[PDB]
Amino acid sequence: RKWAEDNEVQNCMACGKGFSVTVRRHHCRQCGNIFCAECSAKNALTPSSKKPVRVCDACFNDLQG
Ligand SMILES: O=P(O)(O)O[C@@H]1[C@H](O)[C@H](OP(=O)(O)O)[C@@H](O)[C@H](O)[C@H]1O
Ligand SMILES: [Zn+2]
Ligand SMILES: [Zn+2]
Secondary structure (H helix, E strand, O other), X not given: OOOOOOOOOOOOOOOOOOXXXXXXXXXXXXXXXXXXXXXXXEEEEEOOOOEEEEEOHHHHHHHOO
């Protein structure tokens, strides 16, 4: 519900491509947006949980430091 768990996305937010059998879907755990394998191709380690959380390219560098 509060998180974008394929509830009805089927479309990245940035590239906004229609997720298909070729491209997968990945949402940013920080902002909470759905990004395609190309937009979500960046992860960063946060001191909040000591683990690399999946996030888009921007937030990845915005939270990595
Ligand atoms: O990739 P799938 O097997 O279909 O499932 C993915 C997981 O729920 C991912 O969790 P994560 O962000 O914790 O990886 C999420 O980012 C993606 O939107 C989902 O596609
Ligand atoms: Zn994308
Ligand atoms: Zn983000």
